[PDB]
Write a protein that binds this ligand. Structure first.
Ligand SMILES: [Cl-]
Lengths: 337, 339
């Protein structure tokens, strides 16, 4: 069998095009078929060589790129996959300066098969329990990439979910979305990330995705929904805590003003109060009005499915069946007595 | 004379610069000098083709704009004014999809003299008794403009009140403020608009206007104060007093709801505000949305939502509240029949 050292030497000898690919293809077969023993002789040195090559193809502007650049990037990613299917391999991948960012950069929707593979590896990394905030390390890399390209960090994932893509790509994009959100301890993080996806157009995408006759998509959708529901209930529990602690009118008001102080929220708070003063000064109507307002504020702030209200939307759906013929006239008719 | 059809054809070639301007200039003279039978010949079709050019011009990116764009926009506003100087023309303007909006977009503080002409036409629209919601159609147009240009809807009006502007502009902006508020039937609505002006800083702006030795400005200020005064007294009649103090406003709500069935709901509303996501960018938006829902609820009158910006709920609010009242009186008399 071919030695890890032979491969390292070849990788550093400036292979191009079909020759590069030949080498990467052979290495990939070696990586998948050899014992972990052999992967270790490949090691950090071997990994570093793959990542340099991937870097310098990733960096290559459209006008000077080779015809086999995609193929070669993708073949490197298949090598990373093989390198990482064992404990030594993931560990050393995590220990790199740039491995995760280069995996993020491989998430190119114009090369969807490479994007499927890079997303599957980023998901596996998010779900690792050690080190501790792996999902945040993956998100950090996504953010770095967005900063360097001046793009929204979740845009490639959203592009992967467009109607024209393969089902495998849709499923892998939603899988990575689940892997970023679900392992997060903090409710605030999850709602933040979820609301960020929604502002990018996730909701309409989801509507489309719900029509797909595919079991794996149904599973990822379900996992996405479960987590939204769990977050709704965790937030609903936070509201009960508040309703129990904060029962002094002056103190609640003081805390709101502290929160809202010198922010763009302050003029909106005043306006809320100013409009309350304009509630129908009518003994039987005024309680109903305040109830209706409470119903509304309730459904805004405790928004269903654990996401912010869509602030760009014209209309806001409020469940009103919980608040509400000539049955009033005939019941008062029991004035018979 | 030049016929209405000739103008409509000219307006539909691709006239540019001084050529467009001289077409527009003779058109204006035709509109001011010919019989009203002539304006009817120009009609909705001549109107639409004017509004089309205006649209393209409003739209134009600075670096592809002609040297005479603003001159041509302004001359169309002069033609709009002439077209509207009669019952047929004003009526057909009201009927357009975008005339009012295009008028509002002409209110550009960088071209003050066009802004004056446009604001004057919008004030005349607001003051029409028929249709009955003309101030709401103008406010709607102001909200749509604010969304495009990404600004506060009353900012261009406060811009025209700035010290560096001409007196004609200041007077025109205040007249239009007056025309939005004064024809409004509902105290709620006048207070809503005036309150918004105030949060945008109108008060400090007004104090400076009070210093100008100009009769027209003094008129617009007195009209503003007299309506404000009346509103204050109508509202004091309802409550028994200041609008922009947080603590004072809060206390008055408290007193208003204290020991009634509204009081539990008011506390819970405040408590729900504490749940608003602790995020720099999302929090103002949560407050904004809540505010615009509260405004709609309070402003709603027999199927009408007077403010376009406060139409998030697709609910017949008063009908709903009537149903809610209905439910409380069935429980009360049913409770009373059982016993
Ligand atoms: Cl490929």
């Amino acid at each position: 069998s071919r030695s890890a050292m032979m491969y390292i030497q070849e990788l550093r000898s400036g292979l191009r095009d079909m020759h590069l690919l030949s080498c990467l293809e052979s290495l990939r077969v070696s990586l998948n078929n050899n014992p972990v023993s052999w992967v270790q002789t490949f090691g950090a040195e071997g990994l570093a060589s793959l990542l340099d090559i991937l870097k310098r193809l990733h960096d290559e502007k459209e006008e000077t790129s080779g015809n086999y650049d995609s193929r070669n990037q993708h073949e490197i990613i298949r090598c990373l996959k093989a390198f990482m299917n064992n404990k030594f391999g993931i560990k050393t991948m995590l220990e790199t300066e740039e491995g995760i960012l280069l995996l993020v950069r491989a998430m190119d929707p114009a090369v969807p098969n490479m994007m499927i593979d890079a997303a599957k590896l980023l998901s596996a990394l998010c779900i690792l329990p050690q080190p501790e905030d792996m999902n945040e390390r993956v998100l950090e890399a996504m953010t770095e990439r967005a900063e360097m390209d001046e793009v929204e960090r979740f845009q490639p994932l959203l592009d992967g979910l467009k109607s024209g893509t393969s089902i495998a790509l849709k499923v892998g994009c939603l899988q990575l979305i689940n892997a970023l959100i679900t392992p997060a301890e903090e409710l605030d993080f999850r709602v933040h990330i979820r609301s960020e996806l929604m502002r990018l157009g996730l909701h309409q995408v989801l509507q489309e995705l719900r029509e797909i006759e595919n079991e794996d998509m149904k599973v990822q959708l379900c996992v996405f929904d479960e987590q939204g529901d769990e977050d709704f209930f965790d937030l609903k529990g936070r509201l009960d805590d508040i309703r129990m602690e904060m029962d002094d009118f002056g103190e609640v008001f003081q805390i709101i003003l502290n929160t809202v102080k010198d922010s763009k929220a302050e003029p909106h708070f005043l306006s809320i109060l100013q409009h309350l003063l304009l509630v129908r000064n009518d003994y039987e109507a005024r309680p109903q009005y305040y109830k209706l307002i409470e119903e509304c504020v309730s459904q805004i702030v405790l928004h269903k499915n654990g996401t912010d209200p869509d602030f760009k939307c014209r209309h806001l759906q409020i469940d009103i069946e919980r608040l509400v013929k000539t049955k009033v006239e005939k019941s008062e008719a029991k004035a018979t007595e």
